[PDB]
Amino acid sequence: MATGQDRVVALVDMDCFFVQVEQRQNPHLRNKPCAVVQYKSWKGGGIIAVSYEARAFGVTRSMWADDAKKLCPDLLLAQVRESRGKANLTKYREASVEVMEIMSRFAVIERASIDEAYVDLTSAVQERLQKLQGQPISADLLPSTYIEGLPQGPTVQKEGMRKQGLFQWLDSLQIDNLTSPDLQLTVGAVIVEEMRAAIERETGFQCSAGISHNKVLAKLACGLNKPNRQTLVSHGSVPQLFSQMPIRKIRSLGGKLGASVIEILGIEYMGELTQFTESQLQSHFGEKNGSWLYAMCRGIEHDPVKPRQLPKTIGCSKNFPGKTALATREQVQWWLLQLAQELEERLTKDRNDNDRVATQLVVSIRVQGDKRLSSLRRCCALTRYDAHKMSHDAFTVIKNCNTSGIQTEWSPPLTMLFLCATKFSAS
DNA sequence: ATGCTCACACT
DNA sequence: AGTGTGAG
């Protein structure tokens, strides 16, 4: 049986990243209950990132700042830059590039979002096990590492539990066998400690990490001990870990498919999936999903860390909810020009930085009354980085959606505009 | 009326 | 090409 122990994979998550960026810039915010908001006028603004000191009062993402101030009256707020009437996340994108360039010195990186990256450590671990002669790994090389599932068997503070688990792990490690998956994970954790130290020294930013044998376990592991800590989930820890792990906590099972798994099979925890045959799971959820679930509930997953540090699309969108839905033609043309101008700015920077050009322009809208994220998607050729042509072209491909018989009223009103540049080629 | 993004699979 | 899903 192939046991899903072939790779060493990490997931790095910058703790409340947008908050850390504002705290670095403004020392008055450091070590305080702090949140980042956008659009201050409506209910004090929408919270998009929350410091751990503020989370202790119950402040969360997606809260209105006016409501968060009820939970935490001393909450400090930083607001996202606004440019051309919309939130502008350039500062956080630039900080993200800072961190990812440092991570890239250690191993192969897949950018997962602005604040998360997967790390393929398999080759870096091999090189390091050769430089290691055959010498023990000291607990001093793992000063922020938790071993999930330990300590076990025959201390009242969190740091003493951490070290007792690490001691039990290390005392048991079979360091003579350079083939042992547990040893390989441990060396991987040593490298992640070094990577996280380098990020903090060179940027000031802290992060948490998970180290395991695949992306799903690494991501799960990273959330186990936060903030500014890292967790190693071994193959052997999976049966106990999954025995009480709600299905919705595993990456890609937090939405409709995960709910169907729960409801069709009559189970609650990831480990309960082991009692079904692969054919049974495929019959309920399809060939691909069924095979994936059969392997995943045993801790096995093969999605590669893709060598990809740059986004594949560059996009710009704004929502127009409630009374603010766009209902005139010049209004729609105005906001398209606004999105096209920010898009041109970011595209030009991308071409200068990363030696590539986008070739397709995707336009998406949502109309008032519709229920889903996007009402309609249309595309055209992106031949020149010119905001006025891009906005003119985007209007052309959507102007037929105007049900209004009047030419300069727009009905139904538009609740969302979206411009995305894609289909990049080397330049 | 948190938002603004980004990747991938189905057809 | 256009849609639906899942995520930060």
Strands A108-113, A116-120: pairing is antiparallel
Report which residue type is found at A362: V
Query: How far apart (Å, rounded) are the C-alpha atoms in residues A95 and A198?
Result: 15
CA A119-A236-A296 angle, to 5 degrees, is: 65
| Nearest protein residue by Cα to C1' of nucleotide C6 | A252
**Does the annotation flag A1 for ligand binding?**
no
- PDB resolution in Å: 1.9
**Does the annotation flag A13 for ligand binding?**
yes
Phi and psi, residue A66, nearest 5°:
-60, -40
Query: How far apart (Å, rounded) are the C-alpha atoms in residues A348 and A356?
Result: 10
DSSP 3-state of A31 = coil
Query: How far apart (Å, rounded) are the C-alpha atoms in residues A348 and A357?
Result: 9
Contact A404, A411 (CB under 8 A): yes
The spacing between the Cα labelled CA in A20 and the C1' in C6, in angstroms, equals 26
- Contacts of the segment A332-339: beta carbons below 8 A, 24+ positions apart: A332/A395, A332/A410, A332/A414, A332/A417, A333/A391, A333/A395, A335/A85, A335/A417, A336/A391, A336/A394, A336/A395, A336/A417, A336/A419, A337/A387, A337/A388, A337/A391, A338/A84, A338/A85, A338/A86, A339/A86, A339/A391, A339/A417, A339/A418, A339/A419
Q: A315 beta carbon < 7 A from strand B?
A: yes
Nearest nucleotide from residue A310 CA, by C1' atom: B6
| A386: nearest Cα among A419, A341, A346 | A341
Query: How far apart (Å, rounded) are the C-alpha atoms in residues A120 and A69?
Result: 41
Q: At what angle are helices A181-203 and A122-131 packed, to 10 degrees?
A: 100
Q: Chain B: nucleotides under 7 Å from a protein CB?
A: 1-10
Side-chain-facing half-sphere of A364: CA atoms under 13 Å? 15
> How is residue A273 written in tokens?
């999936």
- What number of H helices and E strands is found in chain A? 14, 16
**Does the annotation flag A182 for ligand binding?**
no
- Strand C contact residues in chain A (256-285), C-beta within 7 Å: 256-258
> How is residue A72 written in tokens?
């935490």
Q: A81 beta carbon < 7 A from strand B?
A: no
Other CB atoms within a 10 A radius of the CB of residue A107 amount to 22
Query: How far apart (Å, rounded) are the C-alpha atoms in residues A143 and A137?
Result: 12
Query: How far apart (Å, rounded) are the C-alpha atoms in residues A324 and A362?
Result: 23
Ramachandran area for residue A354 (φ above 0: left; ψ -120 to 50: alpha; else beta): alpha
Please report the DSSP string for A362-418 in residue order. Answer: EEEEEETT--SS-SEEEEEE--S--HHHHHHHHHHHHGGG---SSSSEEEEEEEEEE
- Bridge partners, residue A40, by sequence: none
- Contacts of the segment A311-315: beta carbons below 8 A, 24+ positions apart: A311/A111, A312/A422, A312/A424, A313/A362, A313/A420, A313/A421, A313/A422, A314/A343, A314/A346, A314/A347, A314/A350, A314/A358, A314/A420, A314/A421, A314/A422, A315/A343, A315/A362, A315/A418, A315/A419, A315/A420, A315/A421
- Identify the DSSP state of A308: B
Query: How far apart (Å, rounded) are the C-alpha atoms in residues A30 and A39?
Result: 22
Report which residue type is found at A334: W
Q: A378 beta carbon < 7 A from strand B?
A: no
Q: How were these coordinates obtained?
A: X-ray
Query: How far apart (Å, rounded) are the C-alpha atoms in residues A147 and A160?
Result: 13
Q: A141 beta carbon < 7 A from strand C?
A: no
Cβ partners under 8 Å of residue A53, min gap 6 = A31, A32, A33, A34
- Bridge partners, residue A414, by sequence: A326, A367
Contact A368, A412 (CB under 8 A): yes
